[PDB]
């Protein structure tokens, strides 16, 4: 549901290649994106299920 669920995915400054999930409000689903490993924003979930539970409906 919420308003952090509308923010674009944030890789951040660190240089890991960690695959996480963000809510894509355009698509109306959770998608994967590369998370650099630090300084995460709130639209960042470890599984699709977590993501759908928190955002799905935004």
Q: Which residues bind other proteins (CB under 8 A)?
A: 11, 13-19, 34, 36-39
Signed CA dihedral, 25, 30, 53, 6: sign only: negative
15 vs 26 by CB, closer to other proteins: 15
6 vs 32 by CB, closer to other proteins: 32
| Terminal C-alpha separation, the chain | 4
51 vs 55 by CB, closer to other proteins: 51
State residue 34 phi and psi, 5-degree precision: -95, 125
Minimum CB separation of residue 34 from other proteins in Å reads: 6
């Amino acid at each position: 549901r919420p308003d952090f669920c509308l923010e674009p995915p944030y890789t951040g400054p660190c240089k890991a290649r960690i695959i996480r999930y963000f809510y894509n409000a355009k698509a109306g689903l959770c998608q994967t994106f590369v998370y650099g490993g630090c300084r995460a924003k709130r639209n960042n979930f470890k599984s699709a299920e977590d993501c759908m539970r928190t955002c799905g409906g935004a």
